[PDB]
Each structure stands twice: as structure tokens, then as C-alpha cells.
Design a binder for this molecule. Sequence first.
Ligand SMILES: O=C(O)C1=C[C@H](O)[C@@H](O)[C@@H](O[C@@H]2[C@H](O)[C@@H](O)[C@@H](O)O[C@@H]2C(=O)O)O1
Ligand SMILES: [Ca+2]
Length: 135
Amino acid sequence: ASPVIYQAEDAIIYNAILETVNAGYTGSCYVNYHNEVGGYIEWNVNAPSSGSYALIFRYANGTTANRPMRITVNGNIVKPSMDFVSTGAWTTWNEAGIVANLNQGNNVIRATAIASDGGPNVDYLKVFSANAFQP
Ligand SMILES: O=C(O)C1=C[C@H](O)[C@@H](O)[C@@H](O[C@@H]2[C@H](O)[C@@H](O)[C@@H](O)O[C@@H]2C(=O)O)O1
Ligand SMILES: [Ca+2]
């Protein structure tokens, strides 16, 4: 199966907004976190079969400082501190990814901002099967 893109507009967001300010996003918009601890973006992600999947965030970080996020799958912490390092400009969009085990059906995937400047700007979450890799 082709990778599935979970667009910004389809997320459940908390202390974050959907905006269009910085060029280079895809689809209708991207998420801009409030500049505070604890904002999050959450998607309901389908897994056709149980197994290992790549979860890739397309993101921008126009500050020099890492904007780490806590990644949970169904509330389970799979990455306590996932790095979202500077991309240099707010219009430069890079990828940051992890491999995680998902269950057949829905998986609740959340990225929560750890530090006080909030999370990176997030364009989408891209999900594809990565059975060759093992979390
Ligand atoms: O998260 C940010 O720090 C951030 C996200 C925006 O997408 C950027 O354009 C940039 O905006 C800042 C600031 O947060 C915003 O409130 C407004 O004052 O514009 C600023 C800017 O640098 O243009 O930063
Ligand atoms: Ca922000």
C-alpha cells in the first residue's frame, strides 16, 4: 500500500492552531503550536495489519533551538523526547520520523510539546508499513 498522509486539518489539536502563514506547507494548512508547554496534535491512524510502521512528521522549525516532543501511541510513550531540530527557516520543511508498532485498526498518535517554546510547525504525519524495521 502507498503511504497515507494525515493532513493537519484532520488532526485533533490542543493549544495549537491551523494556519497558512509560512510558505511550503502542503494541503490546506499546517499546525502552529502555542508557544508553551503541553500543546499537542493527535491523529487517528489506521493500520491495515498489526506491525511496524514509519511515522514521519513533515515539520518546520525556524528557531535555532530543538523543539522536542513526547510521542504516544494509544497513550503509551513510544518516544519520551523526539527531536525536531532547526530547519533554518520557517519556510524550510524537513522530516523527523520514528518506527512504532501499531495495532490493526485505529491507533491514537499524539505529539506533545515538551518545552516552553512549544512544538515545531507540523505540515502532516505520513504513515507507511516498515516491517523491515523493528521498534
Ligand atoms: O512557533 C513559532 O515560534 C513561530 C511560528 C510561526 O509560524 C512563525 O511564523 C513565527 O511566528 C512568530 C510568532 O510566533 C507569531 O506570534 C508572530 O508574532 O510572528 C512571529 C514571526 O516570526 O513572524 O514563529
Ligand atoms: Ca508555534
